[PDB]
Each structure stands twice: as C-alpha cells, then as structure tokens.
C-alpha cells in the first residue's frame, strides 16, 4: 500500500556524472564511453550569452581549455565537437561505469527521473514530467546545468533530458542528449517565456486508477461518457485531449480495477466541474498529473532494476 | 528555483542491497562490510508469526539455512546473530561497494529517502518522513521488508530505517539499523494500530519559508502570535505542538526571509482558518509537512 512520487534508482547515472570547466564556468557533464556531454553554453562568457555564435566561440578553444573532473581524477580532453546545443568532449578514457544506455527523445506528458548535480556531484533525485508546454517544473540552483533526466527500461538507461536553463517564471528548460531543445527555447540569455501550460489528462486518469488500487473510491460514480463529450469538457479546463491511444494505454488499469476508462473520465469530469468538496485523493487536494499509466503499473506491481 | 520532494541519490545504497532467504521466506538485506542486516522475522514460518520466540527460532538455524544472493552471486553465511529486531548475518566477503556509513536513530518529523526493494533489487526511491505516531507513509508491497531509509549529507550514508511491516491502515513500521522499532510496534502479527497522526508543525513552517524564498507571499499577514496562543490553535487542527527548540531551528530561515517565526506562525493560523481559496503554495493545495528546516535550507541554498 501507499503511492509515492518515485524516481528510478539513480546509481547507474551517478557513475556517469563529471564536472566540466571552461574558463570561469563550471557545470555538469555526462561521461558515457569516451565522450563527455554537456550544455554548449559552458563555452560562453556573460556577454557571449547575449548573442552567441557557438561555432565561432568553439573554434577558439583548445582541448586543454576544457577541464573534466571525474571524482578526484582529471580526465584528458582529446577532442571537442558540437551537436546542436550539446558539446561533446572526447576523453582519453572510456568510463568503466558506463551502463547499458540509449538516448531517447520523450513527448510531453512523459515522466523521467532527474539527477540534480552540482560540480559533477549528485545531490538529489526527483521525478518529474515533461509539461505540455515543454518545460519541467524542476528544482535547480546555480551550477545545476548539465544535470540529466532518465528512465530505466529493463536494464537500459534511457537518457532523455539535459538541463540548460531556468526561465523567468522559475520553470526549467533543456534538451534531449542529441542537443535539441524541448520546446521553443534557445540557449541565449534573452527574455523567453513558456506557453500556457495544460494538465496531462491521461496521467490524471492513471493517478485516479492508482487511488482506486489503494482504496480511495469516493470519486467513483455510476456514469460514463463518450470520448468526444469528455474532450469538450477537457478543452474547457485546459486539460490535454484524451486520444484513443491513451484509452488503450489505460486498458490494463481499467481491467484491474473494473472501472472503464470512460467511466473514470466521468469521475474526472465531475471533479473538474465540482471540485473535491473538502476531500483528498492519495493525500492530494489537486489532481496529480505527473504519473504516467506505466509509472502506476510499475509502482503498484513492484518492478525492479538490478 | 522550484521546490520538489527530493530524495538523495540512491547509488551508494543500491550497491548494498542483497536478497536474503530463510526457508520459504525471501526479503531484502543490507550488506555493509562483511555483515548482512535484515528483519529477524525472515526466520519465521506462517505458524510462528503471532507469538514468535526469536531466540528459540534462531538457535535452531544453521548458517546454511540462510541464502544470501548479491546480484547473481551467492554469499557464504559464516555466522548469525540478532540485535533487537534485526538479524545480522556474517558473510565470507566484505562488500566492495560499502560506502562510508553510520547508523542513526531519527526522531518524528525527520525525513529520509527510502530505496524500495524486492528480491534484493532496487525498484524506486522516494522521500518519507517519520510521522509523529512513528509510522511512515511509504509505498511498499509484499517482499519489500528489509528496504532501507537513509540520508546522505556530505559523502556519508546515515541509515535510519529498515522496513519490517505494513499496518492494517496501509502505513508502515520499521526499526533503526540497531533493530529497535520506531514507536510502540512489535514484530508479531498481533493486531497493532498506530496512534492518531498529527501534522508536523515545524516542517509546515519550514515549507512556508521555502515558499517565501521561491517568491510566494500571498499567505503572509501583518499579525504575529505568542507561542502559546499558536499552540492552542494548532492543536485544534491536529498539528503537533511547536516548541522553543522548533522556533530556534527556524531561526536561519527567519533571518534569510525577514519573517519572524511567530509572524510565520500567524500566517499558518490564518491558512488553517481560511484554507487556500483556490490558491496553491509551491504547487500544493494542502500544507506540506514532509520537508524539514534542514531540507529547505539544503534545497534552496545548496
Ligand atoms: O529566459 C531565459 C533563460 C535564458 O537564459 C539563459 C540561457 C542559457 Cl543557454 C543559460 C542560462 O543560464 C545558465 C546558468 N544557469 C544556472 O546556473 C541556473 C540554472 C537553474 O536551473 N537555476 C538557477 C537558479 C539561479 C541561478 C542560476 C540558475 C540562462 N533566457
Ligand atoms: O498490524 C500488524 C502488522 C503486524 O504484522 C506483521 C509483523 C511482521 Cl514482523 C511482519 C509482517 O509482514 C511481513 C511481510 N510483509 C510484507 O511483505 C508487506 C510489507 C509491506 O509494507 N506491504 C505489504 C503489502 C501487502 C502484502 C505484504 C506487504 C506483518 N501486525
Ligand atoms: Cl532526527
């Protein structure tokens, strides 16, 4: 029993975190095989950041301008290149702790664990979702750039996020490990704003199933809805549209609890129109949208990652 | 910026998790140096769980009755002893992944990370607080016994909890790593109930300071209160009494934000009276009590 915001065990990723210094700037790097990946903005001064020409800034750097520290050991940079917004530093040593890994680009609504790092040292792990506006509501301070997000699928780490910046509203933006930003953001010190956010509907439904699995049933009702009627109501409350793919993905949870997806949609519609009436669901007075249907199944069934 | 429920990175603890089997029972063990620690109830059968005599059950076991598996390798048990409710299995190999560690007994209101495990394999990490009724609101299934709670301030792992059981209400009970239960619980299947739970007042105040540090000020007010009048109100909402130790502990956060502790107490009194009126504080519509003053400083300042 119980339902917590749970992150993947971070050990496989911790053994990849290094510190990258270029001049006065220090941030985190991810050391996999013989390459250290980090935000390309590590090469920028504060004035360069206003309108950077990264190709021009990079051509001026030599390998010795990058100091990479793995624990108390300095790694030797023997090459450097850029791929989109990520700098790739070739080092003379393959990381002996490199886990089985892939780089994956995730979609909004997908969740991942973030290993927040400072000076190449892991400080915390938390679970978050890629918001529909492509930001993450992370928790990051100065020096956190280069911290990564990941999932574990079987024994393979899938790296999906690298931290680059914090927007004026305190939300965060970053790239996949191929250096492509999530969202309409750029790596320049300029006024940038995230679009209006929406709630991840399929995730709220998954969390309602988690509540039912844990014995929280007060919000269940006798009613059902059509997908089209539910989507009209979802648009009204700034909820993401629920697709037939989402309905199929919730199938296993629907079969386990005996509550059809459109039956749970009718519970959600009533919750939006009327509120919780002083009640809570899984210790929350708001509808939680940072658990995917896979997260719910994984947590309610005890899947492990040795 | 931002404020999240954040756990410690679990790598140091993952490299210590092993599977312990005794007869038909399998659970998790913590392998540090040449000792594997686990709940002593691993030696019980289904017939023994209401009134086990652990000394009597243990004397009947040989080293070869304990199977310890670390990854795909079997460890050799060369000794066994009990310390309170924890079984200590001496093994023939020191764990090469043993981090710098200590065993600490925590007090209610304290927070820690839990590495939930099944069959000696880590499945997830989450943040918990030791409730005032000495339970934790974890997320554990069958086979989770022996999963541990810990903190990692600096490079030293402080193990503070070992999971033993789930109570009928779905909350969890366990021991420190010296085998002493937190609370009035025993490792017997007899009906046990946790006392009425209360909100950890000092932690709610710390989280209100975290909200102010992150730019949220809507809940502040021009009032202050005496400590005694605050406690008289807070108790009516099932909040733990706020002591002068708690007021002193909040001193650094009070100095950083410019909001005196009793001034923040008056904000808390108003929130308990009015609710949030459609507003949120740090993305929550309820008052959060699983962040300590130390957690807030660590997360906000680094
Ligand atoms: O709207 C916007 C943001 C963009 O400006 C940029 C662009 C780029 Cl590519 C990088 C950047 O800052 C990099 C250095 N940031 C940090 O260390 C940092 C990260 C964090 O998540 N939180 C912080 C909290 C306080 C202070 C520092 C941080 C800033 N324009
Ligand atoms: O009120 C109470 C509890 C005490 O009964 C005990 C005492 C002892 Cl020492 C052990 C025990 O169970 C050990 C085996 N528990 C589990 O695997 C288990 C742990 C968990 O946290 N959640 C579960 C969810 C479902 C099913 C199994 C679990 C039970 N009397
Ligand atoms: Cl403590």
Tell me how far the alpha carbon of residue A140 lies from the centroid of ligand 1, in angstroms. Answer: 9
Q: Closest residue of A to B151, CA-based?
A: A124
Q: For residues A31 and B260, what is the distance between their CA atoms, to the nearest angstrom?
A: 46
In CATH, which superfamily holds the domain spanning B198-301? main proteinase (3clpro) structure, domain 3 (1.10.1840.10)
On the question of a common fold for A1-14+100-197 and A198-301, the answer reads no
Measured between CA atoms, how close is A55 to chain B, in angstroms? 30
At B165, list the tokens: 């059981």
Q: For residues A171 and A119, what is the distance between their CA atoms, to the nearest angstrom?
A: 21
Resolution in A: 1.7
Chain A residues touching residue B126 (CB < 8 angstroms): 4-7
Residue pair B239/B199 in contact by the 8 Å Cβ criterion: yes
CB-CB under 8 Å, A7 with B124: yes
Helix, strand, coil shares of chain A as percentages rounded to 5?
25, 30, 45
Residue pair A14/A115 in contact by the 8 Å Cβ criterion: yes
Provide φ and ψ at A45, rounded to 5°: -85, 175
User: Cβ of B275 under 8 Å from any chain A Cβ?
Assistant: no
Q: Where are the beta strands (DSSP E) in chain B?
A: 17-22, 25-32, 35-39, 66-70, 73-75, 77-83, 86-91, 101-103, 111-118, 121-129, 148-151, 157-166, 172-175
User: Cβ of A163 under 8 Å from any chain B Cβ?
Assistant: no
Residue pair A181/A164 in contact by the 8 Å Cβ criterion: yes
At B191, list the tokens: 């009906």
Residue spans of the domains in chain A: they are 1-14+100-197, 15-99, 198-301
Q: Which residues neighbour A255 within 8 Å (Cβ) at sequence distance 6 or greater? A: none
Atom of ligand 1 nearest to the CA of A189: 5
Cβ(B54) to ligand 2 under 6 A?
Answer: no
CB-CB under 8 Å, B8 with A9: no
Residue pair A292/A203 in contact by the 8 Å Cβ criterion: yes
Provide φ and ψ at B73, rounded to 5°: -115, 135
Buried b (16+ CB within 10 A) or exposed e, A216-237: beebbeeebbebeebbebbeee
Provide φ and ψ at B292, rounded to 5°: -85, 170
At B94, list the tokens: 């020191």
Provide φ and ψ at B134, rounded to 5°: 65, 15
Q: For residues B147 and B221, what is the distance between their CA atoms, to the nearest angstrom?
A: 43
Measured between CA atoms, how close is B302 to chain A, in angstroms? 7
Nearest bound ligand to the CA of residue B171 = 2
Looking up tokens 């919750």 gives A271
Measured between CA atoms, how close is A10 to chain B, in angstroms? 6
CATH of region B15-99, choose from 3.30.70.2860, 2.130.10.10, 2.40.10.10, 3.30.70.260: 2.40.10.10
Number of H helices, E strands in chain B: 8, 13
Tell me how far the alpha carbon of residue A268 lies from the centroid of ligand 3, in angstroms. Answer: 40
Indicate the top mutation candidate among B20, B136, B166, B185 to test ligand 2's pocket, ranked by most ligand atoms within 8 A of CB: B166
Atom of ligand 2 nearest to the CA of B167: 1
Residue pair B99/B15 in contact by the 8 Å Cβ criterion: yes
Q: For residues A41 and A190, what is the distance between their CA atoms, to the nearest angstrom?
A: 13
Listed residue (B164, B134, B137) closest to B39, CA to CA: B164
Cβ(B143) to ligand 2 under 6 A?
Answer: yes
Alpha-carbon distance values, B153 to B100, B122, B299, B302 (Å): 11, 21, 12, 11
At A218, list the tokens: 């007060």
DSSP state for residue B76 in the 8-state scheme: P
Indicate the top mutation candidate among A50, A166, A186 to test ligand 1's pocket, ranked by most ligand atoms within 8 A of CB: A166
Handedness of CA B184, B189, B193, B198 (dihedral sign): positive
Residue B163 annotated to the active site: no
H or E stretch at B148: strand B148-151
Helix, coil or strand: residue A101: strand
- Pairing mode, strands A101-103 and A156-166: parallel
Dihedral angle at the C-alpha atoms of A255, A256, A262, A265, nearest 10 degrees?
-160
Longest dimension (CA), chain B: 69
Give the fold, CATH level 3, of B1-14+100-197.
Thrombin, subunit H (2.40.10)
Q: For residues A203 and A88, what is the distance between their CA atoms, to the nearest angstrom?
A: 35
Measured between CA atoms, how close is B232 to chain A, in angstroms? 24
Helix, coil or strand: residue A67: strand
CB-CB under 8 Å, B6 with A140: no
Longest dimension (CA), chain A: 68
Interface of B with A in 5-34 (CB under 8 A): 5-12, 14-15
């Amino acid at each position: 029993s119980g339902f917590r915001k749970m992150a993947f065990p971070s050990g496989k990723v911790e053994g990849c975190m290094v510190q990258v210094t270029c001049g006065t700037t220090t941030l985190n790097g991810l050391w996999l095989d013989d390459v250290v990946y980090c935000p390309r903005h590590v090469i920028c001064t504060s004035e360069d950041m206003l309108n950077p020409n990264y190709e021009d800034l990079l051509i001026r750097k030599s390998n010795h301008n990058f100091l990479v520290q793995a624990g108390n050991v300095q790694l030797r940079v023997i090459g450097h290149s850029m791929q989109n917004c990520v700098l790739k530093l070739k080092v003379d040593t393959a990381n002996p702790k490199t886990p089985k890994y892939k780089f994956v680009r995730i979609q909004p609504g997908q969740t991942f664990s973030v290993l927040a790092c400072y000076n190449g040292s892991p400080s915390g792990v938390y679970q978050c979702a890629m918001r529909p506006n492509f930001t993450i509501k992370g928790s990051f301070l100065n020096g956190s750039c280069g911290s990564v997000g990941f999932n574990i699928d079987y024994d393979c780490v899938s790296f999906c996020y690298m931290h680059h910046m914090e927007l004026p509203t305190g939300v965060h933006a970053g790239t996949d490990l191929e250096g492509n930003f999530y969202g309409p953001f750029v790596d320049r010190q300029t006024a940038q704003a995230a679009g209006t956010d929406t709630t991840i509907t399929v995730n709220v439904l998954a969390w309602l199933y988690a509540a039912v699995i844990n014995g929280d049933r007060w919000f269940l009702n006798r009613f059902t809805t059509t997908l089209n009627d539910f989507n009209l109501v979802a648009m009204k409350y700034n909820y993401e549209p629920l697709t037939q793919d989402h309905v199929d993905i919730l199938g296993p949870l629907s079969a386990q609890t005996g509550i059809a997806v459109l039956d749970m949609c009718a519970s959600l519609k009533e919750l939006l129109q009327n509120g919780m009436n002083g009640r809570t669901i899984l210790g929350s007075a708001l509808l939680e949208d940072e658990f995917t249907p896979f997260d719910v199944v994984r947590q309610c069934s005890g899947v492990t990652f040795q």
